[PDB]
């Protein structure tokens, strides 16, 4: 691919199909074409031989077709492309995923398996490759680039030097390096990071970034190193700045509140610049079920009053140019017949979807079997015996200890405070919540590491997840050692996942037996389960939007971010590069 499209046989036979002197394998008819090059909606019908579009021509002018798919009252588009995302974040396998979003119009995704990668390494990324080999969803693989996100600070499943990075880049299946989020390292020229981005160029394959906070000059260096995109937009000014920086924009949907501002900013610019594409980054099982994938970003951008001709453009043709795939992202003679037909340019219901000329969805369900894949090597990713009440307390000598706190949810900062010491352990000091983080991949001593957050409300019980970007070790929160080993041990025995405990009971489990990240169950189940666990947890702690919400519990052991975070190692500050082994400062 696109070698498949070049076969002499089909080439010949589509040409003559175009010419008039054969008939097409399919004709799509009676539709209004979203012409994404000119931004007109204009009537046209489409004839297709094999995986090639043979002709876009005058409506009704042709009726010679082995099958006829009909689009009157509706709108024809190329199938949407998703420039950055991760399947893991929805807690399902690639197959369920494909079923979900191929039915919605999305024919190509660009997937950084950075999560499976962290948990299993290349083996992780190998499986990604095998799992997507035959879906009706094109998946372009990207090499996980920072495993682990902060070497020396934390220990996940895996470690990726430039060698391995070079190796992954040699795969046909891989189109580039996934988001480099270790950006001090790229900018300040670290031997690992510079080594990997060298590999990216030596391969002449994409080099994609994460650029949260990078401004003015830091940015010119990220760019200067080789990295060429971003999705971490925060404001209109943020969008404008990095457009003007020359970056491919991966305009994402995971923060609904900034779409209006992105939208205002394109509409005031006047035109949508050809370097803007659409992505999902992370999308949870209930939003995937209710909202959708990629198509949701089309949908909302239009709801926030972007012209639909622009949303689609950026979801198809733009997305094409970037991947260097001249066969995708536009409906035109000689291109792939990756097509969606929409009931209108509001709700974007997919009345029809085709991949490579074969109709694979209709009405919103699949028409085709999705090869499963053997989830085995994905199981048993809990490699640690159950915990005690005592794995959550901090042994410490004195009568009274001075204690380094991890003040602030997200915007993290070093704090401190006195505390008492009964009996061998330190007493949780009023207004503190625990963070226990336990290495669970067997790469390391299974030793529980506690820390005290402040700024987290008060914990009436606990929440263990095993999804904790990016090392994903067993990560627990709570107001007390009891409720806490409840939640830990429920996650451990189902083999990974999440559990809310409280007042000596477990109140919800979303079991997640593959890697501690995804689940075999169908998307309805998983969504249902997720909803219920957010319910559960909403009830063990009163949140305070924005910031001290629930999505933060998945984000706190994320070593490469600025500031203290509790890791599987200690408390990590990635400026220094030091591991703070214990919270006790003295006495």
- Which residue lies nearer to a second copy by CB, 211 or 541? 211
Least Cβ distance, residue 152 to a second copy (angstroms): 22
- Sign of the C-alpha dihedral computed for residues 394, 398, 401 and 406 taken in this order: negative
Q: Considering the complex, what minimum distance in angstroms separates the CB of residue 273 from a second copy? A: 5
Best CA proximity match to 142, nearest among 323, 372, 355:
323
How does DSSP classify residue 212?
Answer: T
CB of 497 to a second copy, least distance (A): 42
Q: Which is nearer to a second copy, 103 or 199 (CB)?
A: 199
Q: Whose Cβ is closer to a second copy: residue 87's or residue 214's?
A: 214
- How far is residue 467's CA from residue 380's CA, in Å, rounded to a whole number? 15
**Closest of 107, 148, 519, 158 to residue 312, by C-alpha:** 107
Residues in the chain, how many?
587
Query: Which C-beta is closer to a second copy: that of 270 or that of 545?
Result: 270
CB of 579 to a second copy, least distance (A): 25
How far lies 138's CA from each of 108, 250, 315, in Å? Answer: 5, 18, 15
Q: Give the tokens for residue 122.
A: 């290349």
String of DSSP letters for 410-454? SS-EEEEEEEE--TTB----TT-EEEEEE--SSSS---EEEEEEE
Pair of tokens at residue 321: 């140019």
Nearer to a second copy, 315 or 317 (CB): 317
**Shortest distance (Å) from residue 214 CB to a second copy:** 11
Q: How far is the CB of 415 from a second copy (least distance, A)?
A: 31
What separation, in Å, do the N-terminal and C-terminal C-alpha atoms of the chain show? Answer: 66
CA–CA distance, 253 with 288 (Å, rounded to integer): 12
CB of 15 to a second copy, least distance (A): 5
Q: Which is nearer to a second copy, 62 or 352 (CB)?
A: 62
In the complex, what is the shortest distance from the CB of residue 67 to a second copy, in angstroms, rounded to a whole number?
Answer: 18
Closest distance of CB 514 from a second copy, Å: 37
Residue whose CB is less far from a second copy, 240 or 548: 240
Comparing C-alpha atoms, which of 143, 168, 128, 139 is closest to residue 373? 128
Give the integer Cα–Cα distance in Å for 554 and 317. 34
> In whole angstroms, what is the distance from residue 558 CA to residue 61 CA?
59
Cβ contact 434:453 at 8 Å:
yes
69 or 266: whose CB is closer to a second copy? 266
- Distance in Å, CB of 156 to a second copy, minimum: 27
Check residue 380 and report its DSSP letter.
Answer: -
In the complex with a second copy, the residue whose CB is nearer, 29 or 502, is: 29
- Residue 184 vs 212, nearer CB to a second copy: 184
- 504-512: which pairs have CB atoms within 8 A and are 24 or more residues apart? 507/461, 507/536, 507/539, 507/540, 508/532, 508/533, 508/535, 508/536, 508/537, 509/533, 510/91, 512/91, 512/466, 512/467
Nearer to a second copy, 287 or 327 (CB): 327
Query: Whose Cβ is closer to a second copy: residue 283's or residue 317's?
Result: 317
CB atoms within 10 A of CB 97: 29
In the bound state with a second copy, the residue whose beta carbon lies nearer, of 444 and 562, is 562
* Minimum separation from the CB atom of position 320 to a second copy (A): 10
**What minimum distance in Å lies between the beta carbon of 141 and a second copy?**
20
List, in sequence order, the alpha helices (H) in 236-324. 236-244, 259-269, 285-290, 295-303, 308-322
Tell the smallest beta-carbon distance from residue 11 to a second copy (Å): 6
263-300: b (≥16 Cβ within 10 Å) or e: bebbeeeeebeebbbbbbbbbbbbbbbebbbbbbbbbb
Return d(Cα 387, Cα 375) in angstroms, integer.
27
In contact, 145 and 160? CB cutoff 8 Å? yes
Q: 273 or 429, CB closer to a second copy?
A: 273
3-state SS track over 153-171: CCCCCCCCCHHHHHHHHHC
Q: Which is nearer to a second copy, 325 or 440 (CB)?
A: 325
Look up residue 514 and give its two tokens. 């593959």
Distance in Å, CB of 216 to a second copy, minimum? 6
The 10 Å Cβ neighbour count of residue 478 is 29
Residue that the structure tokens 């509706």 belong to: 74
Tell the smallest beta-carbon distance from residue 145 to a second copy (Å).
16
Question: Tokens representing 367?
Answer: 């028409």
Rg, Å, the chain Cα set? 25
């Amino acid at each position: 691919e696109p070698a498949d499209l070049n076969d002499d046989t089909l080439r010949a036979r589509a040409v003559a199909a175009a010419r008039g002197d054969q008939r097409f394998d399919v004709l799509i008819t009676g539709g209004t074409l979203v012409d994404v090059v000119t931004g007109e909606l204009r009537p046209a019908d489409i004839g297709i031989v094999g995986a090639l579009i043979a002709s876009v021509h005058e409506p009704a002018s042709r009726r010679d077709a082995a099958q006829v798919i009909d689009a009157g009252g509706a709108y024809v588009s190329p199938g949407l492309i998703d420039t950055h995302m991760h399947i893991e974040s929805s807690m399902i396998t690639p197959a369920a995923y494909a079923a979900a979003v191929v039915a919605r119009g999305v024919t190509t995704i660009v997937w950084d398996p950075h999560e499976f990668g962290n948990v299993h390494g290349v083996d992780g990324v190998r499986w990604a490759a095998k799992a997507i080999e035959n879906l009706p969803l094109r998946a372009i693989l990207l090499a996980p680039s920072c495993v682990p996100s902060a070497p020396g600070l934390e220990r996940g499943g895996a470690d990726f030097d430039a060698a391995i990075l070079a190796d992954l880049l040699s795969w046909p299946e891989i189109g580039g390096i996934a988001e480099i989020m270790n950006m001090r390292g790229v900018i300040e020229r670290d031997p690992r990071m510079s080594g990997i981005v060298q590999a990216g160029l030596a391969a002449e394959k994409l080099v994609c970034g994460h650029a949260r906070g990078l401004k003015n000059a830091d940015l010119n260096a990220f760019m200067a190193a080789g990295v060429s995109s971003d999705h971490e937009l925060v404001s209109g000014e943020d969008l404008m700045a990095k457009l003007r920086a020359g970056l491919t924009i991966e305009l994402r949907g995971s923060h609904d509140h900034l779409l209006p501002e992105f939208v205002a900013a394109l509409n005031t610019l006047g035109h949508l610049p050809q370097t803007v594409t659409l992505c999902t980054d992370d999308v949870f099982p209930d939003d995937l079920l209710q909202g959708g994938g990629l198509d949701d970003v089309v949908r909302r951008l239009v709801r926030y009053g972007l012209k639909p001709e622009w949303a689609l453009r950026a979801a198809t043709l733009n997305a094409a140019q970037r991947l260097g795939r001249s066969d995708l992202g536009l409906i035109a003679a000689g291109r792939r017949a990756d097509i969606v037909v929409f009931e209108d340019l509001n709700g974007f219901s997919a009345r029809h979807v085709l991949a490579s000329g074969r109709a694979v969805a209709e009405g919103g369900r699949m028409l085709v079997d999705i090869p499963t894949c053997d989830t085995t090597v994905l199981k048993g990713s809990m490699k640690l015996p159950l915990r005690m009440a005592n794995d959550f307390l901090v042994k410490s000598q004195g009568a009274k200890v001075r204690l380094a706190t991890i003040d602030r949810p997200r915007f993290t900062q070093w704090g401190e405070t006195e505390a008492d010491v009964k009996d061998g352990f330190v007493v949780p000091p009023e207004g503190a919540t625990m963070i226990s983080v336990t290495h669970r991949h067997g790469m390391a001593e299974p030793t529980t590491k506690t820390g005290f957050l402040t700024g987290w409300g008060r914990w009436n019980g606990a929440f263990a997840t095993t999804v904790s970007h990016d090392s994903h070790n067993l990560t627990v929160f709570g107001g007390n050692a009891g409720d806490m080993a409840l939640a830990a041990n429920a996650v451990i025995g189902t083999g990974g996942g999440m559990a809310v405990a409280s007042e000596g009971k477990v109140t919800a489990i979303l079991p997640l037996p593959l890697s501690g990240l995804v689940s075999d169950a169908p998307l309805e189940e998983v969504a249902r389960a997720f909803e219920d666990l957010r319910e559960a947890v909403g009830k063990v702690v009163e949140w305070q939007p924005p910031y001290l919400v629930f999505k933060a519990c998945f984000g706190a052991t994320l070593a490469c971010n600025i500031g203290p975070h509790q890791t599987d190692m200690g408390i990590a500050d990635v400026l220094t590069g030091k591991v703070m082994e214990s919270p006790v400062i003295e006495v």
